[PDB]
Structures are given as structure tokens and as C-alpha cells.
């Protein structure tokens, strides 16, 4: 039932998921001037050399590129994190127009899209248990702006016609998520939530300061996807982003400057 329209979009979510109005909801606007530089924050450690992608899926809200998370192969640690977080999937949120799409904003600036690399804390044994813990997930957020193509994204873009509609999946092996990372790992971090239902407050957010560039043609392809299932009226998969939520009693920390 929940989705991104007038009648079931983010403003409606609290009815099914009352935690929508909770104390640590995501996304948020990152006020770069009031973010506190924290010299005790470590460099982020991204170990994706052994990543094993398996499949890409249109789940009717976005597309997920899923990884084999049954061994320590693609892991996030360091930064603000204690312990080891395993990559389970990535997906994006994007706009109907280049002027919007991102979930987090930076001094109210919206980017064309936002990539979420979703990782779960190995101490909880799996994803479903981890989401029920306040430190269960680490999501690495990366902004996309429109300009030069991102070569490492093209394999993703090229398979989308094969998963046009809700419920479609395709084999997606040997995809290397290192090709989606900007040069710098400078980041902001704060305690938040999943940005889609069930909106669980289980996320340490790590948002990179440096956006990646993707071409207009790459993002256009994202916009050809469908929210609907095959043999239904076409609703383009666009504007699948939740707007900024109240910061409330939280401090955003910066790894830099």
C-alpha cells in the first residue's frame, strides 16, 4: 500500500508506521555549518574487493543490487562504527527532474539522486535481526549529480530494461561496487532510520561529502523504470525519495575540516 504518490506517499506513512514521526528519522538536511568536526572519527574503511553481486531486482519502489552476505566479503568498518558491517544490497533514490531526487540534502541542496549501500552489523548474525537493533545497520550514502558519465554505473544502467516492472529480477554477477565511489571518503555521520517503511531506527548514516557524476543518459534510464507490475498501467519510477525529516535531538558530525 505505501508508495510515493499523493495518496500513499511519505506524508501518509505514519498511519501504517507510527515511527515515521519518531525521534531519529531519516533523511535529514545536513547543515554543513552546524555539523561538528570530530577529530576522534576514524577514516572510513571500505573493503569491497571480494564483493559478490548475485541479482538485481525491481521491488516496486526502487531497484536493489543484492550481494552474497553469507561471508565477510564486502565490509564497512572504521569511520564512526564499532565492529564490522556486511554489504547486503545497494539501491538509489532519484527524481523526475535533475533538480531533485536525493533524500539527504546539503544546506537545502537536493542532488539528482542518492545511492545507498546498505550494510548490517555482523554481531547480529543477519539483516532481519540487525534492523531490530539501534546499531544494526550502516548505510553509506553517496550523492549523484548530472554531468560526465560514471563508467562503473553503466553495467547497472544496461540491465534495467530487463527489470522494467515490479517483481522482475535478473542475474547480476561480478558487479564491482568500487566503481560507484567518489575519490574522497570524507563523510558526515548521524544516527537515523531506514528511509522507507518500516522506517526502523537502526541506521548509522555515513554520507559522503563528494558526489559522483552520472550522465543525463544514465539517469534518464533510471526514469524509464516502472513502479507498477507487468501488464499494469504505466507509472514511471521517479521521485522515490523521502523528504528531509526533523533533526530533533541529534548532532551531525563531520570527519573533515
What are the binding residues for substrate? 195-196
Strand, helix or coil at 8?
Answer: coil
Name the nearest CA neighbour of 141 among 227, 59, 79.
79
Burial label for 149, CB within 10 Å (0-12, 13-18, 19+), is middle
With vertex at residue 77, the alpha carbon angle to CA 75 and CA 78, rounded to the nearest 5 degrees, is: 155
Catalytic site includes residue 61: yes
Catalytic residue among 1, 61, 104, 119: 61
Which C-beta is closer to ligand E2I: that of 61 or that of 147? 61
- The residue within the footprint of ligand E2I, chosen from 195, 218, 226, 255 (CB under 6 A), is 195
Check binding of 150 to Zn ion (CB under 5 A): no
Task: Compute the least distance from the CB of residue 242 to ligand E2I, in Å.
Answer: 8
CB atoms within 10 A of CB 81: 19
Binding part of the chain for ligand E2I, among 170-178, 195-203, 220-228, 233-241 by CB under 6 A, reads: 195-203
Task: Compute the least distance from the CB of residue 204 to ligand E2I, in Å.
Answer: 11
Strand, helix or coil at 161?
Answer: helix
CA 94: distance to chain centroid? 10
Task: Compute the least distance from the CB of residue 257 to ligand E2I, in Å.
Answer: 26
Binding part of the chain for ligand E2I, among 31-39, 79-87, 167-175, 193-201 by CB under 6 A, reads: 193-201
- The residue within the footprint of Zn ion, chosen from 86, 104, 110, 116 (CB under 5 A), is 116
Which C-beta is closer to ligand E2I: that of 200 or that of 207? 200
DSSP secondary-structure letter at 83?
S
Task: Compute the least distance from the CB of residue 37 to ligand E2I, in Å.
Answer: 25
- In which element (H, E) is residue 192 found? strand 187-192
Strand, helix or coil at 156?
Answer: helix
Name the nearest CA neighbour of 22 among 249, 205, 206, 240.
249
Name the nearest CA neighbour of 20 among 204, 251, 252, 243.
243
Check binding of 104 to Zn ion (CB under 5 A): no
With vertex at residue 88, the alpha carbon angle to CA 213 and CA 219, rounded to the nearest 5 degrees, is: 25
Check binding of 128 to ligand E2I (CB under 6 A): yes
Check binding of 86 to ligand E2I (CB under 6 A): no
Which C-beta is closer to ligand E2I: that of 165 or that of 245? 245
Residues that bind Zn ion (CB under 5 A): 116
Residues that bind ligand E2I (CB under 6 A): 116, 118, 128, 131, 139, 194-196, 198, 200
Catalytic (active-site) positions: 61
Amino acid at each position: 500500500h505505501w508508495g510515493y504518490g499523493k495518496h500513499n506517499g511519505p506524508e501518509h506513512w505514519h498511519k501504517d508506521f507510527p515511527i515515521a514521526k519518531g525521534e531519529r528519522q531519516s533523511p535529514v538536511d545536513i547543515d554543513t555549518h552546524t555539523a561538528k568536526y570530530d577529530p576522534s572519527l576514524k577514516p572510513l574503511s571500505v573493503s569491497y574487493d571480494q564483493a559478490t553481486s548475485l541479482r538485481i531486482l525491481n521491488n516496486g519502489h526502487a531497484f536493489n543490487v543484492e550481494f552474497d552476505d553469507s561471508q565477510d566479503k564486502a565490509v564497512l568498518k572504521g569511520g564512526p562504527l564499532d565492529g564490522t558491517y556486511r554489504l547486503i544490497q545497494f539501491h538509489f533514490h532519484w527524481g523526475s527532474l535533475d533538480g531533485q531526487g536525493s533524500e539527504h540534502t546539503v544546506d537545502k541542496k537536493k542532488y539528482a539522486a542518492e545511492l545507498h549501500l546498505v550494510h548490517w552489523n555482523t554481531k547480529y548474525g543477519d539483516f532481519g535481526k540487525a534492523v531490530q537493533q539501534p546499531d544494526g545497520l550502516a548505510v553509506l550514502g553517496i550523492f549523484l549529480k548530472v554531468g560526465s558519465a560514471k563508467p562503473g554505473l553503466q553495467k547497472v544502467v544496461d540491465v534495467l530494461d530487463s527489470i522494467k516492472t515490479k517483481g522482475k529480477s535478473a542475474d547480476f554477477t561480478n558487479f564491482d561496487p568500487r566503481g560507484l565511489l567518489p575519490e574522497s571518503l570524507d563523510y558526515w555521520t548521524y544516527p537515523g532510520s531506514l528511509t522507507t517503511p518500516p522506517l526502523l531506527e537502526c541506521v548509522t548514516w555515513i554520507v559522503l561529502k563528494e558526489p559522483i557524476s552520472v550522465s543525463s543518459e544514465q539517469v534518464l534510464k533510471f526514469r524509464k523504470l516502472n513502479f507498477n507490475g507487468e501488464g499494469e498501467p504505466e507509472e514511471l519510477m521517479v521521485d522515490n525519495w523521502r523528504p528531509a525529516q526533523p533533526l530533533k535531538n541529534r548532532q551531525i558530525k563531520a570527519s573533515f575540516k
